[PDB]
A paper describes a structure:
The L protein is a multi-domain, multi-functional protein responsible for transcription and replication of the viral genome.
In this work, we present the structure of MACV L protein in complex with the Z protein solved by cryo-electron microscopy (cryo-EM). The two zinc fingers, located on opposite sides of RING domain, use conserved C39/C42/C58/C61 and C52/H55/C72/C75 residues to coordinate the two zinc atoms, respectively. Loop 1 of the Z protein contacts the L protein core lobe and the palm domain, while loop 2 interacts with the core lobe and the thumb ring. Residues LPhe642, LAla643, and LPhe689 of the core lobe and LPhe1378, LVal1388, and LMet1389 of the palm domain form a hydrophobic pocket at the interface between the two domains. The side chains of zTrp43 and zPhe44 are inserted into this hydrophobic pocket, just like one end of the staple. From the proposed model, the Z protein in the MACV L–Z complex is proximal to the putative product RNA exit surrounded by the structural elements of core lobe, palm domain and thumb ring, about 37.4 Å from the RdRp catalytic triad that is located in the central cavity. Considering domain rearrangement is needed for sNSV RNA polymerases to perform and coordinate complex catalytic reactions, the Z protein might exert the inhibitory function by locking the multiple domains of L in a catalytically inactive state.
Numbering used by the authors:
A (entry chain A): 2 to 175, 180 to 305, 321 to 461, 468 to 513, 520 to 804, 820 to 874, 886 to 922, 950 to 1039, ...
B (entry chain B): 34 to 82
């Protein structure tokens, strides 16, 4: 009571302007008593913060704090009997209402676990409020401090600085755990230290549950077994083992019997059971269409560009949405296009045949708009119907394109020229042929693929590129694009979409489809030879999985010849295995299925199992997967039909076995050409969940809904504790029950007690002791708008629009300014179509729902005949509505089709209007918006609007005034969710939730637990504890590179020295092991600290893995309603409905440790037990083993004294390990020749270069930001890809696919661009800064104009070096620009004006001059900050040809323009400068009109040279000496041999060398480093400091003799 | 020398010619002389006897 006189005088400076602060103070000043002064004098600090969130938003503050059912009864509204919630502020108007809550936290950890409760308690209120007929718009407020306006921010901290003492004195002068959470809530801004000591100052109560744990969970562990008793125990165990279970035939391994595998493989692969045909082109359906196109074309124009010019003007005229709908704005320019076609027949005598049937119109056809082929008679009828509907359609919309419009056009009279219907009949009669047909739903003649010469097989893949390109840009067609005519045996194809593809100079193809977007379609493929049509088929495949072969004929025709030249030792074997392999490489890409991906991955385990000497017993019943179709057989007869061909013949087919292994391994990895994409994601999560639950209910531990806070009931407790003591049963001497999870409790005791003493090869000495934005919901992971945000931006948009027309009183909403807000905060008609069409269809289907419910809510905001019984509601509509609730979710599969036509087509009444009214005053969108779909042809959405129109959705209390758990909701800042007293299993606030997701690996989809925000801060502690303990260990290699490198360096020399080296695995290492095992291991460790020799307490870790024992794995919401419709997981649902029928949304468990949570806390457990088992063979089989570990794969190398007699060594080695629930997977294979570790296979004397993971990884992953960044990634993957020695010829054909993906993409070409061609040696010597010089001086082929800039660089660089200053004032000379800095340097070094006249004349046209390319400061600063501080691809390349060919360049002034507009402003300069290299280097006088971009190349040459001389060499300067056969397969090792003229340790000096360069950029965000750091900051294409702080990072390059000796040399 | 198996065919044990820096067996010795005299495993010449 020492501050109580200060308190009333402290807070008098807050004026009660309203009635909300007057009633507070007169019951504050009138109570000089500390007992209500901390209840009624303390609830004011909430009431000042709550008022801020009502002055900002539109709001009326709640002064009574009362219920919601009677806040709707103040208006005249019938009772809905809502649940009882209390709002801290509302605002109602009409029949919409704005609940706004208020809550404030400081730390983020207990903020999001208040936001996720508030949003769920608000959205569990709409469903009872929907039935009364009023919808809500709910908001929340995130506040991380106090920022009030009504006080002046200098007295509110005096509250929590002077009320923090009054409660300590108030309860010391005169309830238990409700005290210190108040302290952690009231305090100052918390720069709070988080560590393992944070757990220590909690309360630690008990539960009367952990005693029945400890009766089952620490009993057998005594942990100090004497080390002279374990040996005599294990001798009895082996004496039992060999006499007991081995000789009676229960051992798990065997001796491979190397002929029986190649009797087994024939019945494995050659499916003689089924009825497929041998001919490969027949069974598959797209191989047939390649074969039918490619033998119709091999054995064998100013008006055209005028037509395409007005077509590309129509493409710009469409994207403005100006003719009040999307129907007549398309027939209008249909009329324009048909008039411009009929104004060709009045020109030359012949043009529509000789120049148009060879181009854009086939028989009865026309090409227009988005992509539509329109096919003339039908088109002709439509225009006559539209002019019949309207007497004078084209008199005002003829030139409404002037006013309120662009008013820049080129259509001269075709706008107004009425198409003479008595004229087009002649043209429609002239060209007549059979119409396009597009199918749904005997003998062979296919010319026998092995019987074709070695040229006409390339003409398969060059039809495959051209069919794949027309597949890919069938994604680019606009994702709305509704047709003009809508609506399964065989369909004659009236109008449909279209893509084109050229083959030769007369004939083209077509590609016809109906559905736009990224799903599966029903395609059809035509040719057009000289006008004649010929149908060639139909197929059914999926677009975005064909991105692999888009331009890469030369890649996939160079590696099917690289891989063959490995077999020049049996020439007859090569000339047969050549023309069988290329059929396989066609057969994979022409049928990408996961199954003939999984099968080809499954042969790198069959192949170790035949070079080695012991294979596991069950593996041949695992390499088979049944052919679900009749297309996965013709691939599974060319793979197995190859391994029978060259693994084993009946004769001695073991001539050169090493290359046989190499060439079969790069056929097992020929798997990887198929795109990892998970073909549909609602059939991926069924598999993910079904793999999650089946090792769990088989053992019996899964439960249903827990409490999520603390307690468990008794029946739920019993299954948990019974799983606990059933996990630990497994007595030591029974060979049955060995495929069962858990540990033998008596064997783990020796395993830890021998670890206490120092006899394992590792021991616990444990240096440097360890004790030192939007975030989604957790039931739908992997998605891009989770269900919480899809309403939150709705409420934000409604609150933003509700205020904008109440400031002035417009009361009319604009149909683009109501789409201007959502499309802005998700990611002026031109700016919309700039940033509308840069979405994906996954987001277009969300943008439609947001537009939908926002316009419905706005219609409800100002709002204040059912006798269409064609089909009786009596049994249809009412039931559908009730079952499906709201109209928005109503299905279309309940009715027929024509009923949607006839029930829509009731007459005009009060439901409708005319003049669709593009201004649209509010209160009419329930009748205006319906007519816009009454006039456009769609019916179903009009049915939903007609239904949503017609009403068719229907003192004790003062002792309680101290803060109790009934007194929680009195405050916003109370922080109810706070950790205050942890329990045996919980943390009083949460229970460590998770959520499910998959990972998209190659063969089998891996699950991955997305965790919540408290769970990450409670997982990182344990994970870095194990990272601290395993740091002092010696055998793991998971986080440390160095020990992994020592393991590889051991494996190389120990394969070559006659060892017996294994390669293990562990089957379902994730979902078998449990946190209880980690508890029973962490009880009896010692870990004595080197600083203070004592036994440390691990209680802060022992009391947090108990939290991980009881996790709460969710279910995904996308699987809870697909299993609800209709498979042992499905039985697990449909036996837990005959209990209390709530859905099983939570599975508290015993045994998961999902792959990626507790990862390093099995990195030690995979090491302690491995050293125990690696001690078990030093003592009972007198050898000296050594066992590495990468937490999922092992290798236990074994030496032998003084060749597989000792199966007893290995079959015993499994038998102990299954006693510790470390199983050995049937994928394991052990012998003495091939051994593996993290997929780096070490064959005898060498390494297998493994060509087809790198090329298959570089053909994919083309990620697009800018066409300079995309020539960084693929240049780096070429730098690694020569470190395994592919060739240079495969390297120089990735680098034209990456060049022509740009030269197709509108950008054109530029002299840096993609990386160079004809590269031979310089991958060894030099980074990306060197290769550009060999690219630029490849243009100057006579080498007579960059010689002088090299001589000037010889003048400069010897002067700028040490021992001399020679203009170290260049910091300001560079910043003049680029164009004139060389004009300083050359006359510095000294020559005439004529040298600058003949040098500065060369200019390359740039595009990122003033700003850089935009599509929705250098990169130097973002490069330095990352040293300072710490979707499908084939739809992410289309956004690099859709938002780049449109407006993407910027000027120095405010503005933007096109690219074709810039390239239209350049002349023709034939006089020998443009004739150096065409279209790349220009003259000077040809750059008159466009003159503000052009830098020289020669300045870039000079800056690259002075960069490279800094970075290496002093030999970049010389003229290239002309170069200097060995066998084609003699490859060997080289080292980089670089001479670097800096000194190292640049980790800090780059920061200290910007003060002399640019001070304020450093403010807000050695010996030779400084003169070539200002030669980096002025552009982007240079890259020094990314290559001086790192190193070359491979340094071990291996290359052919014929492509390392053939190269040049550049000496000094 | 290195490991006691044939460098070429991997699955033999006995009666091996001590070649340059790698073993070689009598079975696979016949299948190298018909191509040329230079080897194709270490790329250095070999003894004939
Ligand atoms: Zn041999
Ligand atoms: Zn040799």
């Amino acid at each position: 009571d020492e501050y109580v006189q200060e308190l009333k005088g402290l807070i008098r400076k807050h004026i009660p302007d309203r009635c909300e602060f007057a009633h507070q103070k007169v019951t504050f000043l009138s109570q000089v008593h500390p007992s209500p002064l901390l209840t009624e004098g303390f609830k004011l600090l909430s009431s000042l913060v709550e008022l801020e969130s009502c002055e900002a938003h539109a709001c009326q503050a709640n002064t009574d704090q009362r219920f919601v059912d009677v806040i709707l009864s103040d208006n005249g509204i019938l009772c809905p009997t809502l649940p009882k919630v209390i709002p801290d502020g509302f605002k109602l108007t009409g029949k919409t209402l704005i609940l706004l809550e208020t809550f404030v936290r400081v730390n983020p950890d207990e903020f999001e676990k208040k936001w996720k409760a508030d949003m769920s308690k608000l959205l569990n209120l709409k469903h009872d409020l929907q039935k009364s007929g009023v919808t809500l718009v709910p908001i929340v407020d995130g506040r991380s401090n106090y920022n009030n306006r009504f006080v002046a921010d200098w007295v509110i901290e005096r509250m929590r600085w002077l009320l923090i003492e009054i409660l300590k004195a108030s309860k010391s002068m005169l309830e238990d755990q409700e005290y210190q959470r108040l302290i952690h809530s009231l305090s100052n801004v918390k720069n709070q230290s988080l560590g393992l000591e944070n757990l220590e100052h909690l309360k630690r109560n008990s539960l009367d549950y952990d005693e029945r744990l400890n009766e089952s969970l620490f009993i057998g562990l005594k942990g100090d077994i004497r080390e002279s008793t374990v040996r005599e125990e294990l001798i009895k165990l082996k004496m039992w083992f060999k006499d007991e279970v081995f000789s009676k035939g229960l051992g798990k391994f065997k001796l491979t019997d190397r002929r029986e595998l190649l009797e087994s493989l024939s019945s494995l692969g050659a499916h003689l059971d089924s009825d497929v045909s041998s001919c490969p082109f027949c069974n598959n359906k797209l191989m047939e269409i390649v074969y039918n196109v490619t033998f119709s074309s091999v054995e064998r124009t100013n008006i055209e560009k005028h037509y395409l010019s007005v077509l590309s003007l129509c493409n710009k005229i469409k994207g403005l949405k100006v003719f009040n709908t999307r129907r007549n704005t398309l027939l209008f320019l249909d009329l324009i296009m048909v008039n411009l076609m009929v104004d060709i027949s009045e020109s030359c005598q012949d043009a529509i045949e000789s120049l148009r049937k060879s181009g854009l119109i086939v028989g009865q056809m026309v090409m227009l708009v988005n992509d539509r082929v329109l096919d003339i008679l039908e088109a002709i009828k439509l225009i006559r119907k539209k002019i019949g509907t309207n007497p004078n359609w084209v008199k005002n919309c003829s030139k409404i394109l002037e006013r309120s419009h662009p008013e820049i056009w080129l259509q001269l009279n075709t706008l107004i020229r009425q198409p003479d219907f008595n004229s087009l009949i002649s043209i429609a009669q002239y060209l007549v042929s059979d119409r396009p047909i597009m199918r749904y739903s005997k003998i062979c003649r296919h010319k026998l693929f092995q019987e074709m010469s070695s040229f006409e097989q390339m003409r398969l893949f060059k039809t495959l590129s051209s069919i794949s390109l027309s597949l890919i840009n069938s994604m680019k067609t606009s994702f709305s694009s509704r047709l003009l005519v809508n609506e399964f045996g065989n369909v004659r194809l009236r109008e449909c979409y279209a893509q084109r593809f050229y083959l030769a100079e007369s004939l083209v193809g077509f590609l016809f489809y109906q559905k736009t977007g990224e799903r599966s379609r029903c395609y059809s493929v035509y040719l057009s030879d000289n006008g004649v049509m010929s149908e060639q088929g139909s197929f059914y495949c999926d677009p975005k999985r064909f991105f692999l072969p888009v331009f890469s004929d030369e890649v996939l025709a160079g590696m099917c010849e690289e891989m063959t030249s490995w077999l020049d030792f049996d020439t007859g074997l090569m000339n047969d295995t050549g023309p069988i392999l290329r059929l396989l490489v066609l057969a994979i890409l022409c049928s990408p299925s996961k199954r003939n991906q999984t099968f080809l991955q499954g042969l790198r385990y069959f192949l170790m199992a035949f070079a080695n000497q012991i294979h596991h017993i069950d593996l041949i019943s695992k390499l088979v997967v049944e052919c679900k179709s009749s297309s996965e057989v013709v691939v599974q007869r060319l793979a197995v039909g190859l391994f029978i061909r060259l693994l084993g013949g009946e004769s001695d087919a073991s001539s050169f076995f090493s290359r046989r292994f190499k060439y079969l391994l790069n056929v097992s990895y020929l798997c990887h050409l198929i795109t990892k994409e998970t073909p549909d994601r609602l059939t991926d999560q069924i598999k993910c969940f079904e793999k999650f639950i089946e090792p769990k209910v088989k053992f019996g531990c899964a439960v249903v809904n827990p409490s999520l806070n603390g307690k468990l009931t008794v029946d739920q407790e019993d299954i948990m504790i019974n799983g606990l003591k059933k996990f630990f049963s497994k007595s030591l001497r029974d060979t049955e029950d060995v495929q069962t999870p858990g540990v033998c409790k008596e064997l783990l005791n020796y395993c830890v007690s021998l670890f206490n003493r120092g006899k394992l090869k590792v021991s616990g000495e444990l240096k440097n002791n360890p004790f030192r934005v939007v975030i989604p919901k957790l039931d739908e992971l992997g998605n891009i708008l989770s269900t919480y945000d899809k309403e939150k931006l709705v409420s934000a948009c409604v609150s933003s629009m509700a205020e904008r027309f109440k400031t002035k009183g417009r009361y009319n909403l604009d149909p683009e300014s109501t789409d201007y807000l959502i499309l802005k905060n998700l990611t002026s008609q031109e700016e919309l179509s700039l940033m509308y069409e840069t979405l994906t269809e996954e987001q277009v289907e969300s943008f439609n729902e947001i537009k939908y419910d926002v316009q419905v809510a706005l219609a409800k905001m100002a709002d204040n005949s059912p006798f269409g019984v064609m089909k009786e509601i009596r049994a249809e509509v009412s039931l559908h509505e009730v079952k499906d609730f709201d109209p928005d979710v109503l299905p279309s599969d309940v009715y027929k089709e024509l009923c949607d036509a006839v029930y829509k087509s009731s007459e005009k009444c009060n439901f409708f209007l005319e003049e669709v009214l593009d201004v649209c005053p509010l209160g009419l969108l329930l009748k205006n918006l319906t007519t816009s779909s009454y006039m456009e042809e769609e019916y179903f959405m009009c049915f939903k609007y007609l239904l949503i129109q017609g009403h068719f959705d229907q003192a004790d209390k003062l002792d309680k005034s101290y803060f109790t758990n009934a007194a929680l909701r009195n405050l916003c800042f109370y922080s109810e969710d706070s950790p205050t007293e942890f329990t045996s299993i919980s943390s009083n606030s949460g229970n460590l939730k998770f959520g499910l997701s998959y990972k998209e690996q190659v063969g089998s989809n891996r699950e991955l637990y997305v965790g919540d925000l408290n769970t990450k801060l409670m997982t990182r502690l344990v994970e870095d504890f194990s990272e601290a303990v395993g740091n002092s260990m010696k055998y793991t290699c998971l986080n440390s590179e160095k020990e992994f490198e020592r393991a590889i360096c051991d494996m190389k020399m120990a394969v070559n020295n006659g060892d017996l080296s294994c390669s293990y695995d562990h089957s379902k290492w994730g979902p078998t092991m449990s946190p209880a095992l980690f508890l029973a291991l962490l009880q009896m460790l010692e870990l004595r600290t080197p600083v203070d020799r004592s036994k440390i307490d691990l209680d802060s870790v022992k009391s947090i893995l108990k939290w991980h024992l009881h996790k709460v794995v969710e279910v995904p919401i996308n699987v809870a309603e697909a299993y609800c419709i209709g498979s042992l997981s499905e039985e697990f649902f449909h036996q837990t409905m005959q209990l209390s029928g709530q859905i099983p949304s939570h599975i508290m468990s015993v045994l998961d440790m999902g792959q990626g949570i507790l990862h390093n806390t099995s990195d030690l457990y995979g090491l302690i037990t491995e050293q125990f088992l690696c001690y078990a063979l030093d003592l009972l089989y007198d050898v000296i083993p050594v066992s590495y570990t990468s937490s999922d794969d092992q290798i236990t190398l074994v030496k032998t004294p003084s060749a597989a007699e000792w199966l007893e060594m290995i079959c015993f080695h499994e038998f102990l390990s299954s006693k510790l629930n470390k199983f050995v997977s049937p994928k394991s294979v052990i012998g003495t020749f091939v051994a593996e570790f993290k997929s780096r296979f070490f064959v005898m004397g060498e390494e297998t270069p493994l060509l087809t993971k790198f090329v298959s990884a570089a053909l994919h992953n083309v990620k697009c930001k800018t066409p300079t960044q995309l020539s960084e990634t693929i240049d780096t993957i070429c730098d690694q890809c020569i470190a395994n020695g592919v060739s240079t010829k495969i390297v120089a054909r990735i680098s034209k696919r990456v060049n022509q993906l740009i030269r197709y993409s509108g950008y054109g070409d530029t002299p840096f661009g993609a990386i160079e061609d004809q590269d031979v040696k310089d991958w060894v010597d030099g980074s990306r800064g060197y290769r550009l010089q060999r690219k630029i001086e490849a243009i100057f082929y006579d080498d007579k104009e960059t010689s002088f800039i090299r001589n000037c660089a010889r003048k400069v660089f010897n002067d700028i070096k040490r021992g001399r200053i020679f203009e170290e004032n260049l910091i300001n000379l560079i910043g003049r620009g680029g164009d004139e800095a060389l004009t300083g340097f050359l006359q510095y070094a000294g020559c005439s004006e004529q040298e600058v006249n003949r040098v500065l004349n060369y200019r390359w046209v740039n595009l990122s001059s003033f700003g850089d390319l935009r599509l929705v400061v250098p990169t130097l600063i973002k490069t330095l900050q990352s040293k300072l501080s710490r979707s499908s691809v084939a739809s992410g390349f289309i956004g690099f040809c859709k938002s780049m060919g449109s407006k993407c360049v910027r000027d120095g002034k405010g503005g933007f323009l096109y690219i074709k507009e810039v390239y239209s402003g350049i002349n023709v300069c034939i006089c020998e400068i443009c004739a150096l290299k065409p279209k790349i280097i220009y003259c000077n006088d040809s750059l008159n009109k466009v003159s503000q971009f052009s830098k020289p190349i020669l300045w870039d040459y000079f800056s690259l040279v002075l960069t490279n001389a800094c970075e290496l060499g002093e030999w970049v300067f010389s003229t290239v000496k002309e170069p200097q056969l060995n066998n084609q397969n003699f490859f060997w090792a080289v080292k980089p041999k670089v001479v670097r003229q800096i000194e190292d340790q640049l980790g800090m000096n780059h920061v200290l060398q910007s003060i002399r360069r640019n001070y304020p950029v450093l403010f807000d965000e050695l010996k030779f480093l400084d003169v070539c750091i200002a030669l980096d900051m002025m552009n982007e294409n240079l890259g020094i400091i990314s290559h001086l702080l790192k190193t070359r990072d491979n340094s071990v390059y291996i290359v052919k003799q014929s492509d390392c000796a053939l190269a040049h040399i550049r000496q000094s | 020398y290195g490991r006691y198996n044939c460098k070429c065919c991997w699955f033999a044990d006995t009666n091996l010619i001590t070649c340059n820096d790698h073993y070689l067996c009598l079975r696979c010795h016949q299948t190298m002389l018909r191509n040329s005299e230079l080897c194709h495993i270490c790329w250095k010449p070999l003894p004939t006897s």
